[PDB]
Amino acid sequence: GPVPSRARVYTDVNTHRPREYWDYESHVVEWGNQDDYQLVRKLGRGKYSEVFEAINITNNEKVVVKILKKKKKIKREIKILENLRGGPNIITLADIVKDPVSRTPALVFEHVNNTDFKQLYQTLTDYDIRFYMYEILKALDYCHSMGIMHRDVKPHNVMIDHEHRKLRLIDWGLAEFYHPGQEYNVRVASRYFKGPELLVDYQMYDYSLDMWSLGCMLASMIFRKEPFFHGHDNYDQLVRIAKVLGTEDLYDYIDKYNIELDPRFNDILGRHSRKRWERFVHSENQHLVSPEALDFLDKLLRYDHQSRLTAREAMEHPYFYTVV
């Protein structure tokens, strides 16, 4: 059997809070008025939803409406969003509405004038990345301090209105309350941002999963390679990580937690030395790289979830000296 694990920070936030804080199934929703919103255009779609740009007709403000396609999953997202409302750089849930006849619910968010990261990330300066990384860290330390793991940290879930230097960590639909010893679903986050704990099916993970995901984002931004670890599937995703971090530290990790690796992994992982971060530094990205960026990245991208920086430790890193 695998060795148990608990978060080294905010372990019992949900334990010492009242039942109604984490017990989202008991939360009774007070519905807003659907007729306050006019849908303007489709912005996207997910597995469980469709997203639209809308207008709040009572004040002419732009909003984002997420129309939900499971009752338990709906209440979880709402409770997390309400718990986190007002938190630094956390998307604001402005309203919750429902078709009064069909009962189909929808969440109304504040609008962020985002620039697609495939266009934006190319124009960001060294200072810009440090600033935005510090802003994501504020949201992560906040949600973690409130006993919540985001579990889907990636650039598409980070809205940036660059003109206003405004950042919001969005789509808390995969977010979950942390309870020490709980066995969580490893089928979370986007492939490229999945922590090794998920890829090896280690279910007793915690907030430190978000720090890996953030590490993947930092690497993609300072090295101008999006995504940084580009696997063709979940198995190959771990191979991509092993080709950078090396197999020795991977097998030490599996060994430490007594993880039984899938038979598929053995032959495909092979043997790879740990690469120096400097290897990924080239003429075009060098202006975004510094010894502090590499030391910071190196402390985020650790196989052992218990050895990655916490969001508060990350905010203290010298990489953010000019920002703070």
Which residues are marked as active site? 152
Cβ atoms of 203 and 183 closer than 8 Å: yes
Q: With CB under 6 A as the contact rule, which of the stretches 18-26, 30-38, 47-55, 282-290 interacts with ligand 5Y4? A: 47-55
Question: Considering the rule CB under 6 A, would residue 100 count as an interface residue with ligand 5Y4?
Answer: no
The nearest distance, CB 285 to Cl ion, in angstroms, is 27
51 annotated to bind ligand:
yes
* 3 state DSSP class of 39: strand
Q: Does 113 bind ligand 5Y4 (CB under 6 A)?
A: yes
Please choose, out of 43-51, 117-125, 209-217, 262-270, the segment that lies near ligand 5Y4 by the rule CB under 6 A.
Answer: 43-51
Taking contact as CB under 6 A, which single stretch among the options 26-34, 80-88, 110-118, 286-294 is the one that binds ligand 5Y4? Answer: 110-118
Site string for ligand 5Y4, 166-185 (x = CB under 6 A): ----xx-x------------
- Residues 180-209 binding Cl ion (CB under 5 A) are 207
Positions in 139-168 near ligand 5Y4 (CB under 6 A) = 156-157, 159
Task: Provide DSSP, 167-206.
Answer: EEE---TT-EE--TT----S--S-GGG--HHHHTT-----
Residue window 102-131: x/- pattern of binding to Cl ion, with contact defined by CB under 5 A: ------------------------------
Helices (H), the chain: 19-22, 71-84, 117-120, 126-145, 196-199, 208-222, 234-245, 247-256, 263-269, 291-300, 311-316
75: helix, strand or coil: helix
3-class SS at 163?
helix
Site for Cl ion in 49-88 (CB under 5 A): 49
Widest CA span in the chain: 62
When CB distances are held under 5 to 8 angstroms depending on the partner's kind, the choice from Cl ion, ligand 5Y4, none that residue 310 binds is Cl ion
- From 70, 57, 69, 66, select the one nearest 91 (Cα to Cα): 66
Binding partner at 159 among Cl ion, ligand 5Y4, none, C-beta below 5 to 8 Å by kind = ligand 5Y4
Question: Is 284 annotated as ligand-binding?
Answer: no
Phi then psi dihedrals of residue 200, to 5 deg:
-95, 10
Q: Mapping DSSP to helix (H, G, I), strand (E, B) and coil, where does residue 42 land?
A: strand
Q: Which does 170 bind (CB under 5 to 8 A by kind): Cl ion, ligand 5Y4, none?
A: ligand 5Y4
10 among annotated binding-site residues:
no
